[PDB]
Each structure stands twice: as structure tokens, then as C-alpha cells.
């Protein structure tokens, strides 16, 4: 099972490869905002699942599919992202919804 990221604003989908992908300020997500680290978080696709680990002092945020609040993630800990969940690299910007691929 694979995954894509759907920006909450409706922009193009972001394909994720198996394994670990460093995300943040860079070409993959297109983020240029200096408040976002070039090494902001790790995404891991493995065994049909996706998890994220923040690796910067500037935080990441997580919104379960059933809730309606972007909550801050604890640093350097893994959090699984289910299809329909969202995460963000700023409190109110660069938000991405998780989509599953067959």
C-alpha cells in the first residue's frame, strides 16, 4: 500500500516513495517559507503504513480524521498517519491530507 499527500488548499498531489523521505523546505513539497526547516520531519512508508517523526525544534502538527484541531506532535517521536488524517509544518499553513493508493 502506498500514499499520496493532498495539500488542504487543493494543489497538486505529492507522491511518496517507499522508505524514509525528509520533508520540509524543499522541492518535494515546494515549500520556500524560511520558517520551515529544510530538515523539518521524516516520513516513512513501510508495510502499508505511513508515520512521521518531527526532527526540528520548529514543530509539526497532527489532525486525526475524526477531530478538527491541528495538535502539536512531540519531538523526535513517531506518529502514524492514517488515510484521511492531516499534518502540517506550520500551525496554519502547509497542511497535507493523507490519501491511500491500492
Amino acid at each position: 500500500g502506498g500514499f499520496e499527500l493532498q495539500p488542504r488548499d487543493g494543489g497538486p498531489r505529492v507522491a511518496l516513495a517507499p522508505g524514509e523521505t525528509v520533508i520540509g523546505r524543499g522541492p518535494l513539497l515546494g515549500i520556500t517559507d524560511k520558517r520551515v526547516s529544510r530538515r523539518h520531519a521524516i516520513l516513512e512508508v513501510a508495510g502499508g503504513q505511513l508515520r512521521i517523526k518531527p526532527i526540528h525544534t520548529n514543530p509539526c502538527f497532527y489532525q486525526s480524521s475524526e477531530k478538527s484541531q491541528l495538535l502539536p506532535l512531540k519531538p523526535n517521536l513517531w506518529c502514524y498517519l492514517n488515510p484521511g488524517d492531516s499534518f502540517s509544518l506550520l500551525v496554519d499553513k502547509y497542511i497535507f491530507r493523507i490519501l491511500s493508493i491500492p
Binding site: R25, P27, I31, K34, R35, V36, R38, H56, N58
Partner: peptide, 7 residues
Amino acid sequence: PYAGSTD
């Protein structure tokens, strides 16, 4: 456009 130090 992705270089430079983080705030």
C-alpha cells in the same frame, strides 16, 4: 529558492 538558514 530552497537554500538559506531557517528562521
